[PDB]
Amino acid sequence: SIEIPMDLTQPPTITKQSVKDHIVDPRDNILIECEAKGNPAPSFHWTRNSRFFNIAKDPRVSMRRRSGTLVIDFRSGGRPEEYEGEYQCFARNKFGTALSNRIRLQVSKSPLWPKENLDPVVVQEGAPLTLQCNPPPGLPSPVIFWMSSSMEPITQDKRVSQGHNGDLYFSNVMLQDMQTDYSCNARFHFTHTIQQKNPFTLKVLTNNVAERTPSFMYPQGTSSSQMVLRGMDLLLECIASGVPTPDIAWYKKGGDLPSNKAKFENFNKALRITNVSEEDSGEYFCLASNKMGSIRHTISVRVKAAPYWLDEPKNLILAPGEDGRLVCRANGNPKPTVQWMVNGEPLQSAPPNPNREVAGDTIIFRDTQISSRAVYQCNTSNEHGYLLANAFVSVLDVPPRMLSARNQLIRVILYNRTRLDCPFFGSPIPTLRWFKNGQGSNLDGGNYHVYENGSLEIKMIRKEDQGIYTCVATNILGKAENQVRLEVKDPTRIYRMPEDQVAKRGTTVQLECRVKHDPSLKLTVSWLKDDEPLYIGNRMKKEDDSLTIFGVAERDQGSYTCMASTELDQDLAKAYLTVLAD
Amino acid sequence: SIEIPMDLTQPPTITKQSVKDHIVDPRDNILIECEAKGNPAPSFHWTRNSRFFNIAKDPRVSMRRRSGTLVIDFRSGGRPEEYEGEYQCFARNKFGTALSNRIRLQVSKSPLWPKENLDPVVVQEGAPLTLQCNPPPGLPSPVIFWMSSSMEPITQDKRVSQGHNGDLYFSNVMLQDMQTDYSCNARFHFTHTIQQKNPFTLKVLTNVAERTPSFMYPQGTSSSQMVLRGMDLLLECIASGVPTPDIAWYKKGGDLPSNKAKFENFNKALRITNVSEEDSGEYFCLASNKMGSIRHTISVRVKAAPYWLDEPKNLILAPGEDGRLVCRANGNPKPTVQWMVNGEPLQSAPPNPNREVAGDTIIFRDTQISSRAVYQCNTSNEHGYLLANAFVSVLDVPPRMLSARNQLIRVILYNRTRLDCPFFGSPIPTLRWFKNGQGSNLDGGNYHVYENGSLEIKMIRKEDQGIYTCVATNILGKAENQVRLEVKDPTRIYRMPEDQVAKRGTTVQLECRVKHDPSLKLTVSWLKDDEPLYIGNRMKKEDDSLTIFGVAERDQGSYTCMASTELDQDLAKAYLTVL
Ligand SMILES: *[C@@H]1O[C@H](CO)[C@@H](O[C@@H]2O[C@H](CO)[C@@H](O[C@@H]3O[C@H](CO[C@H]4O[C@H](CO)[C@@H](O)[C@H](O[C@H]5O[C@H](CO)[C@@H](O)[C@H](O)[C@@H]5O)[C@@H]4O)[C@@H](O)[C@H](O[C@H]4O[C@H](CO)[C@@H](O)[C@H](O)[C@@H]4O[C@H]4O[C@H](CO)[C@@H](O)[C@H](O)[C@@H]4O)[C@@H]3O)[C@H](O)[C@H]2NC(C)=O)[C@H](O)[C@H]1NC(C)=O
Ligand SMILES: *[C@@H]1O[C@H](CO)[C@@H](O[C@@H]2O[C@H](CO)[C@@H](O[C@@H]3O[C@H](CO[C@H]4O[C@H](CO)[C@@H](O)[C@H](O[C@H]5O[C@H](CO)[C@@H](O)[C@H](O)[C@@H]5O)[C@@H]4O)[C@@H](O)[C@H](O[C@H]4O[C@H](CO)[C@@H](O)[C@H](O)[C@@H]4O[C@H]4O[C@H](CO)[C@@H](O)[C@H](O)[C@@H]4O)[C@@H]3O)[C@H](O)[C@H]2NC(C)=O)[C@H](O)[C@H]1NC(C)=O
Ligand SMILES: *[C@@H]1O[C@H](CO)[C@@H](O[C@@H]2O[C@H](CO)[C@@H](O[C@@H]3O[C@H](CO[C@H]4O[C@H](CO)[C@@H](O)[C@H](O)[C@@H]4O)[C@@H](O)[C@H](O[C@H]4O[C@H](CO)[C@@H](O)[C@H](O)[C@@H]4O)[C@@H]3O)[C@H](O)[C@H]2NC(C)=O)[C@H](O)[C@H]1NC(C)=O
Ligand SMILES: *[C@@H]1O[C@H](CO)[C@@H](O[C@@H]2O[C@H](CO)[C@@H](O[C@@H]3O[C@H](CO)[C@@H](O)[C@H](O[C@H]4O[C@H](CO)[C@@H](O)[C@H](O)[C@@H]4O)[C@@H]3O)[C@H](O)[C@H]2NC(C)=O)[C@H](O)[C@H]1NC(C)=O
Ligand SMILES: *[C@@H]1O[C@H](CO)[C@@H](O[C@@H]2O[C@H](CO)[C@@H](O[C@@H]3O[C@H](CO)[C@@H](O)[C@H](O)[C@@H]3O)[C@H](O)[C@H]2NC(C)=O)[C@H](O)[C@H]1NC(C)=O
Ligand SMILES: *[C@@H]1O[C@H](CO)[C@@H](O[C@@H]2O[C@H](CO)[C@@H](O[C@@H]3O[C@H](CO)[C@@H](O)[C@H](O)[C@@H]3O)[C@H](O)[C@H]2NC(C)=O)[C@H](O)[C@H]1NC(C)=O
């Protein structure tokens, strides 16, 4: 994007705002951030739950100065729970209105366990069991762990373990499972509060045990489906029941699991993919292998995606009569529908503009004038999420300006690459060109590259590349110039490097390190034993050109690295020293 | 006390109410119980915070029919915490008004820890340390326990342990104490909620020389504690020394009661379970150490909330009869007695010539139909109060029998028995028992009579069978009741099964011959080891024996023949071994 200096008339641009999913602690005061720039002093106003939000009628809510940030303070009283809901910020000035994202403000709660009286569980020895937890809801979901009601630890293993939902599955119940009662505990993220379910008590009955084929406990049926969004974590689970404790092995149709992202958890009963993508979609099956038999359960994984920018709409900097366009393209599954708004008002009912023609996801401005100076908003949305973007159209008439300091100085060593910065601005976007030493030929093509923001990269510097560089930005209203002096220094090169050698114990070894460098530079040389900095000690002599070691033994054996560095350059030399044995 | 039947006119009486300290869950609907009786069906009203509580103006509050029990519903909205306060119930009818205890409705609290940023504690090795917990107050009091932030347990011993206040004391800090971080935790059983304090981090510094012991928790040479009668007395002494000192507990001029005194917290705490006025005195603790010994004295005084010596009972009188209401409560300090008539102070009550008050006793002389009312006694000291309702009833009904006529009670020979003969009379009737028209009153050996009219027979012989007559008499007349007591012969197993050793494939038999009374249903069962029988499968249950065929390893054990009837039980045990 291209910004506009603040001295020039400008529609508001939102700088900082709260996150979409704004979860808060039930103790702290609450802050809904909304800050925005604008050449005329921008005024802010809010909407809570799609209706106007009057700050003046609520004493706890106050708005910061020169911004729209709201602070709600509970020192006088009140509780944050009553402020949950969707909030939207609006930043206005005489030239237009910019919108923020919809802040879904929720407070992280720790609700108690619903009062329930649990009867003593009775089960046959060797039978499968499921103790459902059913934890209270929290934001984020609380961490579920099982303990005795006396808070002694329950040991989980391949035979008895909990799923992601929290329920505790016993593949086959044993007598020893009566050693403890099973109470579910939920730990909440922001308060670290634990809520405890009533404890379960088991009563096992002995046989009058016979073996049994595996059977699936958690994923009922032969097949199942899951839907996970792009970039989220995919968590599949398979729980089996069998008298000989089954072993769960995961496989994928037509492909192996990605080694860099897939991980096994919960004793190979859980498979987690970290950063899922369209490629991760498919058919994942799990085998509950056992001494008696083996059965398979299949899972159809479809990966959808919330919209993400391919081309985000950028501000339109225009001169009167110049043609431009706003392009708003997001990608996602399903394909995101584009909705256009002008100053927070739907485009279908906005004040008509003859210069403005809308088509699909693109707005075209032909012969733009001082009118239609407004902030357009694009909302690209699908069932799984939205993307909201602000882009203003600014029609102005100012000559080109230079934004950086004049006659800068940049030093660089010979073969390095470098970048000269020359940011600029003009009412119609001025064209920028670089010249060297008063040459009429502009610098572009081989070895040179010009970026949109005016900076020039030299990819491989020659000694001839030293000198004065002038960047010139020009439009019909005039031109501006800027100067930067590039100085090529001589490279720091180690022309006598330490050589690998094999020495018998007691000898004196010398590793030479002679370096040439630019005289107008502070060169510092250091040594590294193996790959860590070497401490200079007794029997070690660090000359300016070498490093000598007296009475070598087994400890001195290894790799020595001479490092010669100046403020702009670095050079490494690595040698190996072996020490024989007798 | 003496109850009055509901068909006779009587002032109201409070049957059920909430506790004085009524803690409620913040989720459930609130229920403030107050139920009463009265022959004219009583009406009910409430006072919240000593002023009238208007149920009509509140749509959440509703009063149950035929009672004063309030139900506060929060489905439409609201929170229980906004109904906290003092609630008194008044049960009224044409004959008087009865009061309930003041109900202090409070909602339970499991408060979070305030947002705090704890500095890393730094301490010299061997120095004393106190990690303060300081939990925000909650109802009821939470159980404090220390734990790592990763929820690993913290090991307590003689050197490092926590006091009753919850602070963790280190008599001398060691280098190993940096192995884990220290986080306080409060557990609330009423809501099942654990609140975790931010963890402390320890950083010890090494410079150890020895040091004499010094007291940490009970500062100074002497302190004072006051404990209420019936509660637990907990004394704590924490000492600090370079050699970890040992605390020893003693009492001046007396030995600790072995039945009530307990040493807790590695002998750093003394607990008296059921304290009394005798346990009050001087308890001292020695912090013995290799370097020195120091004593801390604690003066324990035992005060008492009021407890009834004589609880005021309902006065049941006839016109022209004299009676008294006695309200005696013992407590330290001595409880002050305050009398009320129909919930109105006796000073401002309408004067009555028959009633004369004196200290804690009210005397009625020449009682008439007038002045029938419910009197309240409130005996209070700074530690607590006792509230009691008792009404004066003036009726003229003859004695009435409250049980069924011609009752039948059956019992085995040597069981103890009890015959119930509930009665009532306008003047309190004298009750008497007789047998088979022997005329002599039944009392003394083998017989006991209770205040409510019941008759207990301790040992029953075969001669005690027959008809028993209960006679309740007063100046207005007499009533009688008949109970037929039938003694049955005890069920005895006279041929018991004997232990035996029998090999495979042998028809084994365990005999169990039972003699019972012919007019009784006999049920004979068997028990393998200690579980009930399974009938069938190569096991034949005869009426007087049991036979098992194809004996194996499962048959070896202990059999139990059980012979039972409606009134009797008999057990016989044998051991069977199989080759
Ligand atoms: C850009 O365009 C998009 C699409 O057009 C807009 O997104 C729309 O936003 C509106 C308003 O926020 C949504 O309507 C709301 O839907 C709530 C239920 O949503 C859940 O179910 C739907 C399916 O029915 C799912 O699509 C949602 O999932 C999406 O969102 C979640 C996160 O929230 C993501 O994780 C998903 O991936 C999806 O992205 C949800 O699962 C519904 O509850 C809500 O109704 C409440 O709010 C309105 C006012 O907004 C009240 O009128 C109403 O009475 C409800 O309020 C009650 O409850 C609250 C407390 O809960 C009380 O405070 C109130 O007093 C009252 O009692 C509303 O209907 C709409 O669903 C969504 N579009 C889609 C396709 O989902 C973007 O907003 C837009 N962006 C900008 C900047 O304009
Ligand atoms: C039989 O007789 C006895 C003795 O006459 C009566 O006992 C008295 O009862 C009254 C009424 O409840 C008490 O008056 C109240 O006192 C409150 C302060 O007392 C507290 O502090 C003192 C020290 O200053 C302690 O000694 C007390 O502790 C003792 O008692 C409690 C039980 O109450 C025990 O648990 C202890 O172990 C001690 O034994 C107390 O802790 C005082 O706050 C209160 O005044 C509030 O309420 C009235 C209306 O009720 C308002 O007018 C007033 O403005 C106050 O209101 C504010 O505070 C309350 C909370 O307190 C909030 O809810 C309000 O919204 C508002 O913010 C009142 O004055 C008296 O203390 C007590 N005396 C004794 C010795 O126990 C029996 O009730 C009586 N029985 C019957 C059935 O009638
Ligand atoms: C092309 O040009 C670039 C830029 O000129 C060169 O990259 C520079 O290389 C030099 C030398 O290798 C770097 O100088 C060294 O930087 C180290 C990192 O410091 C940064 O990061 C730390 C946090 O890690 C920050 O706190 C700090 O503010 C810096 O931002 C320093 O640790 C070095 O300190 C000491 O190093 C030696 C001794 O080891 C001494 O001689 C030094 O004088 C100094 O006391 C040192 O400062 C420099 O940071 C690099 N800049 C960038 C932008 O990368 C390329 O090497 C060059 N390419 C070529 C020649 O091929
Ligand atoms: C003295 O009197 C006491 C008081 O009655 C008496 O104790 C009670 O005995 C009866 C009868 O034996 C018990 O009733 C039993 O209760 C158990 C449950 O606890 C039931 O399972 C029993 O049913 C079995 O036994 C019946 C006996 O006839 C069978 O008819 C029936 O089919 C079942 O097999 C039976 O109802 C009662 O439980 C006890 N009291 C208590 C508190 O347990 C006592 O036995 C008398 N004798 C002596 C010597 O004390
Ligand atoms: C004009 O545009 C160019 C191209 O985008 C900008 O060059 C880029 O500048 C950024 C910030 O200085 C560089 O990021 C840096 O990357 C290094 C890793 O190499 C990291 O250590 C730094 O902390 C920093 O993030 C980026 O590499 C650089 N890109 C190139 C190709 O040089 C330039 O800054 C813009 N100029 C102006 C005035 O906006
Ligand atoms: C008249 O007063 C006597 C004296 O208390 C009453 O006898 C007592 O009655 C109670 C209630 O039935 C008995 O308690 C019961 O004990 C059994 C055996 O332990 C227990 O299982 C029950 O749950 C209950 O607690 C008590 O034992 C008994 N006392 C004696 C000495 O027999 C009698 O009931 C009163 N009569 C009336 C009509 O109220």
Short mmCIF file of N, CA and C in Angstrom, two decimals, chain A residues 251-299:
data_model
loop_
_atom_site.label_atom_id
_atom_site.label_comp_id
_atom_site.label_asym_id
_atom_site.label_seq_id
_atom_site.Cartn_x
_atom_site.Cartn_y
_atom_site.Cartn_z
N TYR A 251 -3.14 -45.03 9.21
CA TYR A 251 -2.70 -44.99 7.83
C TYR A 251 -3.61 -44.05 7.05
N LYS A 252 -3.15 -43.66 5.86
CA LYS A 252 -3.90 -42.77 4.99
C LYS A 252 -4.02 -43.38 3.60
N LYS A 253 -5.20 -43.26 3.01
CA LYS A 253 -5.40 -43.71 1.64
C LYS A 253 -4.54 -42.90 0.68
N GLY A 254 -3.75 -43.60 -0.13
CA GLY A 254 -2.98 -42.94 -1.18
C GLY A 254 -1.98 -41.92 -0.67
N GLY A 255 -1.26 -42.25 0.40
CA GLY A 255 -0.24 -41.36 0.91
C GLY A 255 0.16 -41.63 2.34
N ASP A 256 1.39 -41.29 2.70
CA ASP A 256 1.87 -41.41 4.06
C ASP A 256 1.70 -40.08 4.79
N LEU A 257 1.56 -40.16 6.11
CA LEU A 257 1.37 -38.97 6.91
C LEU A 257 2.59 -38.05 6.79
N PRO A 258 2.40 -36.73 6.77
CA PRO A 258 3.54 -35.82 6.68
C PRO A 258 4.36 -35.87 7.96
N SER A 259 5.65 -36.18 7.82
CA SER A 259 6.50 -36.37 8.99
C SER A 259 6.72 -35.07 9.76
N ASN A 260 6.68 -33.93 9.07
CA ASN A 260 6.98 -32.65 9.72
C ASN A 260 5.82 -32.09 10.52
N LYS A 261 4.60 -32.55 10.26
CA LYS A 261 3.41 -32.00 10.92
C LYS A 261 2.64 -33.01 11.73
N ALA A 262 2.57 -34.26 11.29
CA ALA A 262 1.80 -35.28 11.99
C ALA A 262 2.54 -35.75 13.24
N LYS A 263 1.77 -35.96 14.31
CA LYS A 263 2.30 -36.46 15.57
C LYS A 263 1.29 -37.42 16.18
N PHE A 264 1.80 -38.44 16.86
CA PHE A 264 0.96 -39.39 17.57
C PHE A 264 0.92 -39.02 19.05
N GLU A 265 -0.29 -39.05 19.61
CA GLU A 265 -0.52 -38.73 21.01
C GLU A 265 -1.48 -39.75 21.59
N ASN A 266 -1.57 -39.77 22.92
CA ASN A 266 -2.50 -40.62 23.65
C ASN A 266 -2.29 -42.10 23.31
N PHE A 267 -1.03 -42.53 23.37
CA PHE A 267 -0.65 -43.93 23.18
C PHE A 267 -1.08 -44.44 21.81
N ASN A 268 -0.80 -43.63 20.78
CA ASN A 268 -1.15 -43.93 19.39
C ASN A 268 -2.66 -44.01 19.17
N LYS A 269 -3.46 -43.53 20.12
CA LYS A 269 -4.90 -43.46 19.93
C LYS A 269 -5.35 -42.10 19.40
N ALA A 270 -4.42 -41.17 19.20
CA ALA A 270 -4.74 -39.85 18.68
C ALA A 270 -3.70 -39.45 17.66
N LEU A 271 -4.16 -38.89 16.54
CA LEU A 271 -3.30 -38.41 15.47
C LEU A 271 -3.56 -36.93 15.24
N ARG A 272 -2.51 -36.12 15.29
CA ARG A 272 -2.64 -34.67 15.22
C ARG A 272 -1.82 -34.14 14.05
N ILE A 273 -2.48 -33.42 13.15
CA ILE A 273 -1.82 -32.66 12.09
C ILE A 273 -1.86 -31.19 12.48
N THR A 274 -0.70 -30.53 12.44
CA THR A 274 -0.60 -29.18 12.99
C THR A 274 -1.17 -28.12 12.05
N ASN A 275 -0.50 -27.88 10.92
CA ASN A 275 -0.86 -26.81 10.00
C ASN A 275 -1.49 -27.43 8.76
N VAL A 276 -2.77 -27.78 8.86
CA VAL A 276 -3.44 -28.49 7.79
C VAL A 276 -3.60 -27.59 6.57
N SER A 277 -3.65 -28.21 5.40
CA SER A 277 -3.85 -27.52 4.13
C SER A 277 -4.73 -28.39 3.24
N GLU A 278 -5.01 -27.88 2.04
CA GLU A 278 -5.84 -28.63 1.10
C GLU A 278 -5.25 -29.99 0.78
N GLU A 279 -3.92 -30.12 0.88
CA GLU A 279 -3.27 -31.39 0.56
C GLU A 279 -3.53 -32.44 1.63
N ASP A 280 -3.80 -32.03 2.87
CA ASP A 280 -4.03 -32.96 3.96
C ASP A 280 -5.40 -33.63 3.90
N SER A 281 -6.33 -33.11 3.10
CA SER A 281 -7.64 -33.72 2.98
C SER A 281 -7.53 -35.12 2.37
N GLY A 282 -8.43 -36.01 2.78
CA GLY A 282 -8.43 -37.35 2.24
C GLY A 282 -9.18 -38.37 3.07
N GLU A 283 -8.66 -39.60 3.11
CA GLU A 283 -9.27 -40.69 3.86
C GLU A 283 -8.22 -41.29 4.78
N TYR A 284 -8.42 -41.13 6.09
CA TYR A 284 -7.51 -41.67 7.09
C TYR A 284 -8.20 -42.83 7.80
N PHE A 285 -7.57 -44.00 7.80
CA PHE A 285 -8.14 -45.11 8.54
C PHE A 285 -7.20 -45.54 9.66
N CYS A 286 -7.79 -46.24 10.63
CA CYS A 286 -7.07 -46.73 11.79
C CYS A 286 -7.41 -48.20 12.01
N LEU A 287 -6.39 -48.99 12.29
CA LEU A 287 -6.53 -50.42 12.56
C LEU A 287 -6.31 -50.67 14.04
N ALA A 288 -7.24 -51.38 14.66
CA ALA A 288 -7.14 -51.77 16.06
C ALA A 288 -6.61 -53.21 16.11
N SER A 289 -5.31 -53.34 15.85
CA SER A 289 -4.70 -54.66 15.76
C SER A 289 -4.66 -55.32 17.13
N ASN A 290 -4.89 -56.63 17.15
CA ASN A 290 -4.95 -57.39 18.39
C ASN A 290 -4.60 -58.84 18.10
N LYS A 291 -4.23 -59.56 19.16
CA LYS A 291 -3.86 -60.96 19.01
C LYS A 291 -5.00 -61.79 18.43
N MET A 292 -6.25 -61.43 18.74
CA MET A 292 -7.40 -62.18 18.24
C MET A 292 -7.75 -61.77 16.81
N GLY A 293 -7.99 -60.48 16.60
CA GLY A 293 -8.35 -60.00 15.28
C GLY A 293 -7.98 -58.54 15.11
N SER A 294 -8.34 -58.00 13.96
CA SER A 294 -8.05 -56.61 13.63
C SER A 294 -9.19 -56.05 12.79
N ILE A 295 -9.71 -54.89 13.20
CA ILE A 295 -10.77 -54.21 12.47
C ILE A 295 -10.31 -52.80 12.14
N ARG A 296 -10.90 -52.24 11.09
CA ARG A 296 -10.52 -50.94 10.56
C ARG A 296 -11.68 -49.97 10.70
N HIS A 297 -11.36 -48.71 10.98
CA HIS A 297 -12.33 -47.62 10.96
C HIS A 297 -11.80 -46.49 10.10
N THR A 298 -12.62 -46.01 9.17
CA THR A 298 -12.22 -45.00 8.21
C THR A 298 -12.83 -43.65 8.57
N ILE A 299 -12.12 -42.58 8.22
CA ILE A 299 -12.51 -41.21 8.53
C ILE A 299 -12.27 -40.37 7.29
#
